[PDB]
Ligand binder design. Sequence first.
Ligand SMILES: CC(=O)N[C@@H]1[C@@H](O[C@@H]2O[C@@H](C)[C@@H](O)[C@@H](O)[C@@H]2O)[C@H](O[C@@H]2O[C@H](CO)[C@H](O)[C@H](O[C@]3(C(=O)O)C[C@H](O)[C@@H](NC(C)=O)[C@H]([C@H](O)[C@H](O)CO)O3)[C@H]2O)[C@@H](CO)O[C@@H]1O
Ligand code: K
Ligand code: K
Ligand code: K
Length: 192
Amino acid sequence: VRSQATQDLSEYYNRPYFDLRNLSGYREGNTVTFINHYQQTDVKLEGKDKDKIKDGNNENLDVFVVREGSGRQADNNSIGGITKTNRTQHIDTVQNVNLLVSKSTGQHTTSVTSTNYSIYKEEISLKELDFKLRKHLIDKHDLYKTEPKDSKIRVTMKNGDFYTFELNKKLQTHRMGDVIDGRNIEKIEVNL
Ligand SMILES: CC(=O)N[C@@H]1[C@@H](O[C@@H]2O[C@@H](C)[C@@H](O)[C@@H](O)[C@@H]2O)[C@H](O[C@@H]2O[C@H](CO)[C@H](O)[C@H](O[C@]3(C(=O)O)C[C@H](O)[C@@H](NC(C)=O)[C@H]([C@H](O)[C@H](O)CO)O3)[C@H]2O)[C@@H](CO)O[C@@H]1O
Ligand SMILES: [K+]
Ligand SMILES: [K+]
Ligand SMILES: [K+]
């Protein structure tokens, strides 16, 4: 079975995305404007990111961009995904963590995939982790070819804190601007 709800998740997580690195964003109201090679990207702040981003100019940011509709209307602007850029613009990973994907393949059978997952950003948004991990799962683990049910991604930190992305719904918009230290990620576990 493939419900419309599942189909809508496939649609969302197949949206075009891009990223911008080490540039200024100018905040007016709750919208941050980025200009990169004369192209404008407006980003909506609607969570804790409202306390993080200053009114006016903010230097040396990165942004993970997922457009919310097509095209030019303001309600289609990307939401959250702003972080401070790395201390340097070096290309090396800043952390590497185990990614464990466990999938029920039958009544009595489970498949377990264990790989290294590279972290490049010192400060990373839940938006980016959510979108990119789902991309991995869609590509490699057939996510959304079946009903996701209670499947989830959990990102666990070195202090034992964790962050969960329930796969049967989009990441909540108010969580998209939440950020974490990528170097404090301990492991990532996915149950399918
Ligand atoms: C009606 C509605 O949309 N309500 C949401 C909350 O979501 C509902 O309740 C949840 C408990 C869950 O049953 C969900 O399905 C309901 O729609 C939402 O609560 C968050 O939900 C997510 C899952 O979607 C997580 O369970 C999250 O908990 C954790 C997490 O695991 O990610 C707990 C964890 O301890 C905490 N980490 C800390 C404190 O270090 C994290 C962390 O705060 C966040 O991940 C940061 O974004 O959260 C539930 O908190 C709620 C909060 O987003 O908003 C509405 O009330
Ligand atoms: K359809
Ligand atoms: K590690
Ligand atoms: K099983």
